[PDB]
Amino acid sequence: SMNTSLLPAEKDPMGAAIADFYHRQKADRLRVFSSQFDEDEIPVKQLFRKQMPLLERTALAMATGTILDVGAGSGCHALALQESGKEVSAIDISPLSVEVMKLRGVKDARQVNLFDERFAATFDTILMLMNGSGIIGRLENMPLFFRKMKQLLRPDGCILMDSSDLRYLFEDEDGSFDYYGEIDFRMQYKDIQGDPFDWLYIDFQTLSAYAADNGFKAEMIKEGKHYDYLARLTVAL
Ligand SMILES: Nc1ncnc2c1ncn2[C@@H]1O[C@H](CSCC[C@H](N)C(=O)O)[C@@H](O)[C@H]1O
Incomplete structure (x- = not known):
C-alpha cells in the first residue's frame, strides 16, 4: 500500500549517496530532477551536518521529552539530540539511510513509513525538518497526516515543522502569478534511479488553514531570510 511503502535499496539514490560517504568519505553527486525545475544536485557532505541552519537549530533546542525524528536521513538531527541526552526515535523509508544511522550510533533507527497503519508509538515532540512538509506530498493528504499525528502525539505534545512559501x-x-507548492522530484546517484515522488512545500497561511480544518492549531515560531519558516502544530484545545 501507499501508506506502508518502503524504498528498495536498488532504487534508493539518497541512501546510496549517504552510504558511499559514510563508508568511503567520498561520493559522486546526488542528482535531482523535477517536472517544474531544471536538473540540480543535493550536496552530500551537507546531509552529514553536525553547522545546521537556523530553523533546524531552533527546533532541536525546543525539542523535549520523547522525540520522533521523521525522515531522519543520515541521522544528523538524531545524533545531535542524543548528545544533548535527549530521547529520540528516528524513522526513514530508505534502507541504506537506516543502515548508516545505525552504524553512526543512532540508538533507535527504524525503516518504517510514517503513514504505516502498523507504526504505533507516542511522542512529546515530532520533528519534521528540512522542508518537513515534504513527506505529506500533496494538500489532499492533509487529513491523513493529521489523523496520524493524533495517533502519535502525547497530551501537550507538539510537531515542529519547517517549510517555505515558493x-x-x-x-x-x-x-503576476494545483497548489504551487505541490512539486515533484526524482533522484539519481551513479546508476541508482529513484522513483518520482511528490514533495510538498507549504506557506504558513495555507498550513494554518489545513491545521484548523483538522483540529490542529499552527503557530509561527521563527522566520528565515529566504521565505522559510518554522511552525509549531498542536492538537486544538
Ligand atoms: N513517508 C515517509 N516516512 C519516513 N521517511 C520518509 C518518508 N518519505 C520520505 N522519507 C524520508 O525523508 C527524508 C527527506 S530528506 C531530509 C533528510 C533529513 N531530515 C535531513 O535533514 O537531512 C529522506 O531520507 C526520505 O527517505
Whole structure:
C-alpha cells in the first residue's frame, strides 16, 4: 500500500549517496530532477551536518521529552539530540539511510513509513525538518497526516515543522502569478534511479488553514531570510 511503502535499496539514490560517504568519505553527486525545475544536485557532505541552519537549530533546542525524528536521513538531527541526552526515535523509508544511522550510533533507527497503519508509538515532540512538509506530498493528504499525528502525539505534545512559501518562483517579473507548492522530484546517484515522488512545500497561511480544518492549531515560531519558516502544530484545545 501507499501508506506502508518502503524504498528498495536498488532504487534508493539518497541512501546510496549517504552510504558511499559514510563508508568511503567520498561520493559522486546526488542528482535531482523535477517536472517544474531544471536538473540540480543535493550536496552530500551537507546531509552529514553536525553547522545546521537556523530553523533546524531552533527546533532541536525546543525539542523535549520523547522525540520522533521523521525522515531522519543520515541521522544528523538524531545524533545531535542524543548528545544533548535527549530521547529520540528516528524513522526513514530508505534502507541504506537506516543502515548508516545505525552504524553512526543512532540508538533507535527504524525503516518504517510514517503513514504505516502498523507504526504505533507516542511522542512529546515530532520533528519534521528540512522542508518537513515534504513527506505529506500533496494538500489532499492533509487529513491523513493529521489523523496520524493524533495517533502519535502525547497530551501537550507538539510537531515542529519547517517549510517555505515558493510563490516567488512562480511569478513573472511584475509579480503576476494545483497548489504551487505541490512539486515533484526524482533522484539519481551513479546508476541508482529513484522513483518520482511528490514533495510538498507549504506557506504558513495555507498550513494554518489545513491545521484548523483538522483540529490542529499552527503557530509561527521563527522566520528565515529566504521565505522559510518554522511552525509549531498542536492538537486544538
Ligand atoms: N513517508 C515517509 N516516512 C519516513 N521517511 C520518509 C518518508 N518519505 C520520505 N522519507 C524520508 O525523508 C527524508 C527527506 S530528506 C531530509 C533528510 C533529513 N531530515 C535531513 O535533514 O537531512 C529522506 O531520507 C526520505 O527517505
